Structures are given as structure tokens and as C-alpha cells.
Design a binder for these strands. Structure first.
Ligand code: ZN
Ligand code: ZN
Lengths: 124, 123
DNA sequence: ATCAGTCTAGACATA
DNA sequence: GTATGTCTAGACTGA
């Protein structure tokens, strides 16, 4: 919770390189998800009701696994998990897929799931 | 041209266009080093314009364009601007010489970028 | 329609 | 076998 005066002031806050980039990455993901009925709704369900189980929300997997957004390359699940869960997330080594996930990064299928709540954070 | 002047000109700032053209030449050299005779041949053509030279080609893309540092153009146009007509407008101002066996229009695997394998025309 | 421009997966290179 | 970053043809998108 935030004070109205404060959230107004925060309205004018400058976002940094990282936050500006993350917006680009979300923009990129939405372009993909609009093309699939149920995806946008589903992802919004997952983000809004974390406690309640949700479906896989996938994008095409590249040959090397990486995704490029505005001249940065990363791994998709890592990217989106940083955005919506663990901003300080280090690498894919700090992530394990839940059993409920049908399309986890490691499975190297056509599709890769980017539902942040289909992943759990770990050590290594 | 004077030594003091060329010294002073040493410190001249190149503009976006010239800096880009340096990149485009760099890009072309990377390609030509890989082909024995190409670099020498291109140098022959540039240095002895009067004397006939061979085709110097690079791979042709599907759409014909070449990209160098986030700018797209047509290769013969690019390299003709560099070494001949800086004010060259488009491929419409260019016609290939008969001596050229890989001219832009021929839409082959290779496209010739020897600037002296082209002549400048109106539109 | 050409034409012109943006974005990135795949290739490739510097580690 | 990683990994990280760069470049650009091709795919795509608007005049
Ligand atoms: Zn999933
Ligand atoms: Zn030629």
C-alpha cells in the first residue's frame, strides 16, 4: 500500500535501463500471446491469483533456448520470472519447474512455458 | 593539398555518413579476405580506373539488400557511393557495363560490387 | 504496389 | 558443453 501523494510523485519517477528493458520484454511477449486464444487471460489469471493453479502459457522455443529482446539475449522463463517474481534471480540454475508444468524449459520441446508460477526458485 | 592542412584535417571529425561508410567497407573486406584475388582485384580497380578489371562479388540476398550496422541498402549502390558518386541517389541512377558478369539486376547467387563495373545514368 | 524501416533467430565470434 | 555478446538476412510491417 502506498499514499496517493506518494504514488502521484512516483508517477514521475524515472525508470532505469533494466525496468525500461523489462517493459520491452513484456511488450514482446504480449505480441506473441495475443495470437493465441486464452493465453493473455491465462497469464493474467496466474499473475493475479497466485494461490490458484493455472495452465501453461508457452512461446516457441528457439534452437539454443535463448530469447532476444532489444539486443539483449536471455532465457525466457528466467526473463519472465524476474519480471513477475524474483527481480534478483541469478540464472536458470536457480530455477526448477513444477510438476504441473507440461512445457518446462528443460524439456526442450517445440513450446516453452513462461508461466512464472510454473517454476520454483532454488539454490545450486 | 598542403601538409599543414592535411595535418589539421587529420583531426577532422567524420560525420554519421562517413563513419557508416567506414563500417560498410569493413563489412566488405571481411567478405573479400575469404576469396583469393578479390582484395587485390578491387584495389586494382580503384587504383587504375582506366585499366579493365574483373568482377568482385559478394553473395546476393533474397531481396537484394545489404545491411551494415542497422542500415539497409543495395550493395552496388553502397560501394559506388563510396568510391565514385557520393551523391548517388538510387539504383535507378545506375546501369551495369557489358564487361560485368554479375551485375545487380542479374539476380544471381553473386552480385558484383566493383564500382567500375557500373556507369552512372539519369532516371 | 515498391519502398523503407524494425526486430530477432540463427550464425558466428570472443570468451 | 558454457556462455555471452555481436551482426545481419530474413521475416514482417507499414507507406
Ligand atoms: Zn507450464
Ligand atoms: Zn562485375
Amino acid at each position: 500500500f502506498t499514499s496517493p501523494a506518494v504514488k502521484r510523485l512516483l508517477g514521475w519517477k524515472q525508470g532505469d535501463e533494466e525496468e525500461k528493458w523489462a517493459e520491452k520484454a513484456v511488450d514482446a511477449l504480449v505480441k506473441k500471446l495475443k495470437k493465441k486464444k486464452g493465453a493473455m487471460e491465462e497469464l493474467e489469471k496466474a499473475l493475479s491469483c497466485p494461490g490458484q493453479p493455472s495452465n501453461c502459457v508457452t512461446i516457441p522455443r528457439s534452437l539454443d533456448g535463448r530469447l532476444q529482446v532489444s539486443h539483449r539475449k536471455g532465457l525466457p522463463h528466467v526473463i519472465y520470472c524476474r519480471v513477475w517474481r524474483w527481480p534478483d534471480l541469478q540464472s536458470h540454475h536457480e530455477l526448477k519447474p513444477l510438476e504441473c508444468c507440461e512445457f518446462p524449459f528443460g524439456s526442450k520441446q517445440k513450446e516453452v512455458c513462461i508461466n512464472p508460477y510454473h517454476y520454483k526458485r532454488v539454490e545450486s
